[PDB]
Amino acid sequence: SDLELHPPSYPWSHRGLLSSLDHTSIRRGFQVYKQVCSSCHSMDYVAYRHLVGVCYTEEEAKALAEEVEVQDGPNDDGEMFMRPGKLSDYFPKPYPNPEAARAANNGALPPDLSYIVRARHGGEDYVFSLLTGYCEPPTGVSLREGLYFNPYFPGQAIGMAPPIYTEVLEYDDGTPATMSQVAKDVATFLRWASEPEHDHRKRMGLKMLLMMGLLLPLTYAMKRHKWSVLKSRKLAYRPP
């Protein structure tokens, strides 16, 4: 309908003014994307070299990219060939073109989740509410097959099947794989994937705030010291 559901404001660990991202949650959300979300969605602006120093070491990310099988070429014989992936290889598209993506996924086009927390109002609150909000339709409304009732999607009829549930993947750090935990981890990872500068941005903001709190009263004191000649000035008028 024309009604809009407004998702609430969850207490994220990076909601604070100087609060960083939980990098273990970013690693777990990358694991969720690699296992679940990469069958249908693409990540066309994130490469494997962005995971070093953030979630994995360089040998771990190199091993992760080694299991990838990438189109390249053309060779000396003049044709496409296939290679294992490098660190400078971007995340693989599931489909070669958006028309095959629309064909496989029952009409609807699964969008690129590289700016999806920066392209939706509510941010990752919207992503968390959409992934955890799959409920049955109310009385009267007819839900067409191929569509599922999510009240947080505008129009309340999404083309996405509910992609997560209890224990949909086995984490490598002994984490309980509940649906809320998976959704929170993948929301943190998607928040990182649209702004990898976020920790660096907040560190610069801290340094800027400390520096500017030092610099405001001293340059104010310079202005006030130079203007104290005029501010203490006294006038007189003595006609003869």
Binding site: L230, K231, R233, L235, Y237, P239
Partner: peptide, 17 residues
């Protein structure tokens, strides 16, 4: 003239402070 100019100058000084 001198009264007006002194009044204007004093008002400018007061609005400066």
């Amino acid at each position: 003239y001198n009264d007006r100019m002194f009044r204007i100058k004093r008002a400018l000084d007061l609005t400066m402070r």
